[PDB]
Structures are given as structure tokens and as C-alpha cells.
Amino acid sequence: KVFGRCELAAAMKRHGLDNYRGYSLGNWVCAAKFESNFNTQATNRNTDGSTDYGILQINSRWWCNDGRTPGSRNLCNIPCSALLSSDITASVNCAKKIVSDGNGMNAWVAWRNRCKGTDVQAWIRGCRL
Ligand SMILES: CC(=O)N[C@@H]1[C@@H](O)[C@H](O[C@@H]2O[C@H](CO)[C@@H](O)[C@H](O)[C@H]2NC(C)=O)[C@@H](CO)O[C@@H]1O
Ligand SMILES: [Cl-]
Ligand SMILES: [Cl-]
Ligand SMILES: [Cl-]
Ligand SMILES: [Cl-]
Numbered sequence: 001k002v003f004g005r006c007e008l009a010a011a012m013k014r015h016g017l018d019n020y021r022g023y024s025l026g027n028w029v030c031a032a033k034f035e036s037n038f039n040t041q042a043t044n045r046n047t048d049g050s051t052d053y054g055i056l057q058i059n060s061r062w063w064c065n066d067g068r069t070p071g072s073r074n075l076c077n078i079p080c081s082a083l084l085s086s087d088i089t090a091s092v093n094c095a096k097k098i099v100s101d102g103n104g105m106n107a108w109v110a111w112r113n114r115c116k117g118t119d120v121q122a123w124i125r126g127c128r129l
């Protein structure tokens with residue numbers, strides 16, 4: 001599924017991401033935009049052979065099992081394919097774990113490079129929330 005910006009914002013809000021660990025909703029929407037272009041089916045391969053999955057490009061090195069990232073962890077205790085669902089619950093629940101792990105949203109490269117320190121509230125501008 002390719003989410004609309006505000007559709008995703010609302011979904012993320014309903015799932016408790018707004019100000020989760022101090023990260024206002026626009027951070028999450030920004031992150032999703034630049035990680036996946038709001039596409040739940042996005043996958044990308046990393047240089048180490050892990051793969052990033054879903055709307056928040058959660059990687060298989062640490063967070064999910066895709067059966068092809070030897071030596072990896074599955075800290076979200078999910079198949080990576082669950083992160084490709086049109087239902088973002090698995091991604092959100094995993095993202096909550098990631099962002100809670102001490103490094104905040106810096107885990108999301110695109111967030112660090114494209115959202116952090118910007119006016120992320122713009123990403124939820126005009127949305128009914
Ligand atoms: C939370 C999450 O999974 N974020 C992804 C990053 O992990 C990806 O970065 C890449 O992650 C792999 C696995 O840890 C690293 O080996 C790799 O070096 C790292 N790549 C960079 C440029 O840091 C990122 C890839 O675009 O995608 C999500 O942000
Ligand atoms: Cl957009
Ligand atoms: Cl915001
Ligand atoms: Cl694996
Ligand atoms: Cl959803």
C-alpha cells in the first residue's frame with residue numbers, strides 16, 4: 001500500500017506514535033516518506049546483505065527475520081514480510097522498540113539525514129488528526 005501523507009499520519013497517530021519517546025508525529029511521517037515513500041512494500045538491500053522492509057525500512061540485520069540475513073537478529077520477533085503489510089501495526093510496533101532502544105530515531109538514516117532538525121510538523125500540516 002502507498003499511503004497518503006495524512007492517511008499515514010492518522011494511522012501512526014492511532015497506533016500511538018505521536019510524541020512516542022518525544023518524537024512528534026511529523027518525525028514519523030517524515031521518516032516514512034524518505035525511507036519508503038510511504039510504500040508499505042518497499043524493500044531495499046543494504047551493503048551487508050540485510051534488507052530493509054516496509055514503510056519504515058526496518059532492517060533484517062537487527063529487527064526482523066527474513067531467512068536470508070545470516071548472523072542477524074530478529075529483535076521485533078517478526079518475519080520481515082510482516083513489515084510489508086498494508087496494516088502498519090507490525091511496523092509501528094517494531095518501530096516503537098527500535099526508537100526505544102536508546103538511539104531514538106537516529107536508527108532511521110533517512111530521518112537523521114532528512115528530517116532531524118527540520119520542521120517536521122510540516123509533514124502533518126493540513127491533516128485531520
Ligand atoms: C531502523 C532501521 O532499520 N533503519 C534502516 C537502517 O538500518 C539502514 O541502514 C543500514 O542498516 C544496515 C543494517 O544495520 C547497516 O549495515 C548499513 O550500514 C546501514 N546503512 C547506512 C547508510 O547507514 C537504512 C539503509 O538506508 O535504512 C533504514 O534507515
Ligand atoms: Cl507525499
Ligand atoms: Cl509534528
Ligand atoms: Cl536470517
Ligand atoms: Cl494501519
Ligand SMILES: [Cl-]
Nearest residue numbers: 021103104105
Ligand atoms: Cl530520543
Ligand code: NA
Nearest residue numbers: 035052057110
Ligand atoms: Na533507508
Ligand code: NA
Nearest residue numbers: 060064072073
Ligand atoms: Na534478522
